[model samples]
Target: HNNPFGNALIPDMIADASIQEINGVFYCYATTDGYGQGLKTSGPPVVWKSKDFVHWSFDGTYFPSAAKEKYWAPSKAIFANGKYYIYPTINGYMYPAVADKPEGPFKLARGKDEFYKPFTPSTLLQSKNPGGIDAEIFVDDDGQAYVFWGRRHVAKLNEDMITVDSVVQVISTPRKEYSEGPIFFKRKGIYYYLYTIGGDEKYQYAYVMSRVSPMGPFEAPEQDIISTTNYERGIFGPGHGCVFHPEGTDNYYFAYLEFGRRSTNRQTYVNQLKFNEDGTIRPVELTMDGVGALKKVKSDKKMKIDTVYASSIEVPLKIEPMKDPTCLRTEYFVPSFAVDGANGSRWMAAAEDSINPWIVADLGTVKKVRRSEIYFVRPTAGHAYVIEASMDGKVWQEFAVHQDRKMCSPHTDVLNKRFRYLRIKILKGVPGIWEWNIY
Candidate 1:
């Protein structure tokens, strides 16, 4: 199987994933965090499609609007009556948008409420006194639909998909660990209620409670956590994604984000989820090597790039570059570390002069460079930079320029050219490069 077997899914920063399978392809919709304005605040809903779970390509924003507002967690796209519907939390509220195809041109959908009018920049799908975050819509086996949002609110949506038909139901988690980002699913005869805790803390994780009905009388699972951290593997705070049981297999998968303490943004990850005979979930053990291809699909084969570099390397002396307290006390962020193919080790520029830091790689000889993969120290936030190529170390030419590009570990650039020297000048954020590879 030609599959990508790494912890990080794609080469971009995305969070709060909702993976939906239509026909045989899997489309992942997620929170667009770590784009241009670089913070925990999110942008529009981001989309990615993959045949297998391994190699994914960006599908751009699912819903593009002229109104510049924050679009947080989006529900998994649900198909109804030849149209696709998605509920995204926009500008502090959830709004229903519709499209003829999966990739949109999605506009705001109208509800059954009498006040429904023409679409505006800020229009509520359904009127709730206050808005909710992380909207999750679940379609049951019997063809009934329910929308779960806020901390503990669950309501039945009309066939229109935008109007609520039932009163809001408030439920409690089995244990009292501050719940948010709610998800619901049913298997056999049991309904599962999964929610996240720990906010922006280092220990964020998901807890699942079970019941026969979606509304109430839930019981704590024998193992309460569905997905959490594997600290030894450097994966911390796995939370806020969906559970998908792909058709034709007993296998189930949990798609979530690893909000590690190192950065304000997060990356998407998927792992197989399991359950015991009693129907309680077996807690997921987050891994560095991700779950491989779930189906037969075309794959991209790229060779690893090995090279040497010369730049400003510094010793980690009491400076908390990652803002993570768990970092090694004597960690050395030397230039060589950025090409060592190891996590945690990196090349961090001096902090005093935080502007436009630069680094260069010296290939032993002139070689055909197909791609450059850069893993940053703060791997989740947005970074603006330019790459230049040179035959000799003196004269440089522009290879690529990115302005406030969304950052992910190993941000890749496809450069089909030959060069002996390569340089990266950071124009925006402070430079903390973990790995820089030339292929």
Candidate 2:
């Protein structure tokens, strides 16, 4: 039941994730925002590889942050013509990069884009200013390939896989909503175009089907194939998923990232994809028991209702690092990372500068408070600390105390206070936490 349970997968702060099965292993590519990159700006895209999609190992950084803005959607990695190619969008400009290995420091195919112009390093190659982000690639059974990205556009790729062979075509969508993060697949001579709707922050997955021939003249979709079933037991951002149906037995699987009710911390989950008699896919429910269903995914004959992507509603609170630790680690780490909800990303206090530092969170107004979980770095356990709470920032009261406890793990303790502020006092060693969640 490693369903989104790969705590060791990749540290927090990875979003806009898209995984691909390259050379028999599933590789996950995602936006690296919470790696101590403060508020608006961010770092490069990270890569991860796994054989069964559950046991994943971190690959090196694939692409650097060429542009200054954050990466939208995710970069798609595919193998073609004896080379590894990736399409990544930075600040809305999708660029094609190539490399020799799957885990890549992918370089620009040609020193620049085939459509490169003056000043701007990237843009569509005169293709009606089409999408240059959220790009995806799908090769037909006949060995022909095409790429789809941004807003809803698909263009044929030349034998090189980067050059264009034809004009770009914008797809006709069913609703008048924001559509991005597109993926393409074929089944029974049917061309299915799936995309995520709503902004990336509040995204959900949806799809539409069309016939191969007489394309364009596509049909519309009334309901989303994947969406949030229930908050307490369903996905919050159930969008930007990819589909795979390798040969031999016609079996299919859907892999997507599940937002972990936190800032940029996204988790991965997979399910057995089944097509009904009408050639349409059945909406599979979210499962926490990881891969194979309780026993299977297709027929939900045996499953736990509460654990299906189970999660509780997040507490509405405002977070900021305390000066003692926030500024001490300010040289490299960001202040808000410790509470950003990303297990892979965290803000820490460096002991070399100052030892026994602490961090705090402002939980807005004081209401009913019972428990809090402090997710710390694996190395900073066994430290002494005390919990203090207060209504106003001026006066405070000590509530609980802990000594010699393992701070390396996510420690959850019961609190009996209604204060708006929480101060975690580190008394012995330097403390580092991925997140300080209160509810």
Candidate 3:
């Protein structure tokens, strides 16, 4: 939780989660606690949205409590029919809610809570506890929508995308000792089912592949994509992953949460997902040094550095900056040197000038040192600019110089240290900056 940008921005209890990007903004919706004594009384599901993955804002609750006391473990999807639907397990049975917008004020799709109840009688299902817990909906190439979930059951949703059109069929049931958290994804016409099994609390997560249709009488893969017990790593419960193309490219990301010492407190971890020669997906070992993927950007070769307006889209850079005595308009420092973007540039700052001033941005952690640039947006003379770098972000070391420089041409410097944080000390000038870019 040292990274406030990553922890504070994303919801703390978002398990059994799903993320979707609509109209340039990423919306994440997930299930809150609904088990323990205090948990049952917890309110409805919540949603979080962000333009840059580092800065997120809570959009507030999307669906309120139904007549049922427990509404837990929700999975969401946007159907081809042009409507947003959320499938949540309510006391064992699944129910549906609809909203016009992705960041939703969702209400029951059938207008009443009871209308969305599961059709499968409680007696028929294996869990006999009213089916439905990790619900996921996938729309295939032929445009038919299928909903997969439960202890190990999957079924197709009607054309209306509301009700189940077929009986739930068991796909792959791990040994009776394990099972839970089932999500389906298709790549190259192959349908893969990923799930977790073991006890409810100290669970071991794993995935199995199948090429058969949605209602599979399919074959199981030779290996489990990710298994907690095999690694001796303390990260206990790793399951319920949603795979999607962050940049809409061939590469995909698998987002899941690792249960910590306390079951109530969980932290989200993302891994770069790869495919095997046999068309199976492989999970990367969780590592702090690992950055899953970078969003793709297109630009002409001549531009030394590219500037992306964070307001335009979700930038895939993950730089954690030091915070406390906030940086004012008179200083520049490099925090981390490992951060690498399209131009291999590091984050920088400049003093205020008469033209423009007061510009700031996070340079996701840089592991490599590169050239830096400074801008004096305001037109001021006789002002000296300072540049410094820090590993722990406490002690400061000055590395570059620019004194009494004109405000028209921005300053550039080549530094040699691999720093994690940067700051700019503005010794003179007004307080504002138009913009600055580092390459």
Candidate 4:
């Protein structure tokens, strides 16, 4: 007998799994790490189906290379519209493939080429820009569907399930030391967005949360709910998770992967998930005991709570050291400056003649902003700082201020303002900055 929700106890590794049960049969599908095999740079996905949750048999490679070298990390969804779709992050953007059976010999869905062609032809260029990868699909109770993935933030796809109707909203970012592996689900009207932080593929596995409606103006909680240690023998990079309930029970299960330390190989694991009384999820932990499925609870009929923060402007600041002169001189900063880790720790100086010493990243168009949080990653003492705002970027207004403070505290400031652009200027300290964000 084997446990469905524990370490396989075998060295055979399976990574990035999407699990589902159909007609009493449980299916586990995952991506094969084919880095050096020359099979295809994107690797191929495999499937295993079992009547009993424990014993399994390999179904060989179901998705062929014809789907292109970029087709990897497949997610299957059966829509209410009498269609079956397989969503995969290809090259840099997401695309749809269709199959009649769950064990797929999927082909690119009609019009998919048109939808994805712009991204494929411009790969070298798009690669430099942030787009999409590690795509996950979730269909809500009202028959609405959404896709979440990352680089900087998670975005919602339109009803077409192919086009993006609105601007990409920031759910989590490097400012909060969070990015990647977005898994969103709703329970009892509380929407949970679970994600990973840290730097490099090896160190990246921590879970954080935010509560919102439909999509989000997600408030990131102060702590990580799940993470791993360097000394752990197994289970590193334990992220990119998905959750579900067994056919008929009141318990939930989360399936995620752990990248092996030495081989860089990945293995999938499952654990029991429990929720707190306030409808928030309790951190999932590995367990041998199987938990039951979640009961079908009716939606809370209370008037929908307005969780969105109307965009407003407020002024506040914190003192911190300035390490990166380049960030202080130039406006467009890289993603490396936002988080604390390997890349963030390296000191980068500014160019002498670079124009626009102050940079502001437009957040696109959003409905509202609650509290704009900024991370002055390199705060210093005996320095004066100002956070500014502007609607058109031509004229600026002071938004926040930072006076002298200790060098050890986390260089973070939150303001109650809504604006299109945010600017930071330093009057003292090291004369450089790492990164600042608008929440």
Best by TM-score: 1
Ten-residue region with minimum lDDT total, candidate 3: 306-315
Tens digit per residue, CA lDDT, model 2, 1-439? 1112323233444456676666566677766544343334554455666565543445335554343345555556777888888777655577677889877666667456333222244443435553456778878888777878867877777778668666768888766577777878788888888777764235666777888532355775555456543344434455566776543448777666655434444445666777778777677666544453221113212111111110121222233222112211112244465554444345566545354466667665666576776655432224567777778766988887877754233456687667777777766644565556676
Which stretches of candidate 1 lie above 4 Å from their native place? 1-6, 35-40, 111-125, 202-211, 228-235, 245-247, 295-300, 308-363, 369-418, 424-439
Write the residue-wise lDDT of candidate 4 on 1-439 in tens digits: 1111133311134455677777777776555542434224543455666565543444335555433454456665555345567666665455666666777676666353333443553221123453566667777777766767765455555565555435566654324664666666677666777666653234344444444564665654444465443222333445665676667666677776654322224446567777777665665565323332223333312112112111221111121112211211112233223322211121123544222234344554422334443323223122355666667666887766777543322244554566665555654453333333334
Tens digit per residue, CA lDDT, model 1, 88-122: 77666677888998888787786431222223334
| lDDT over C-alpha atoms for residue 241 of model 1 | 75
TM-scores, all models, native as reference: 0.75, 0.62, 0.59, 0.55
- Best-fitting candidate, measured by lDDT? 1
Decreasing TM-score order of the candidates: 1, 2, 3, 4
Which window of 10 residues has the lowest lDDT sum in candidate 2?
Answer: 302-311
Task: Check candidate 1 and list the clashing pairs.
Answer: 377-432
Candidate 4 deviant stretches above 4 angstroms: 1-6, 9-11, 34-42, 65-70, 110-130, 172-175, 199-211, 230-234, 261-264, 287-439
lDDT of 4: 0.48
Worst lDDT run of 10 residues, candidate 4, spans 308-317
In each prediction, how many residue pairs overlap at the backbone (N, C-alpha, C within less than 3 A)?
Answer: 1, 9, 46, 22
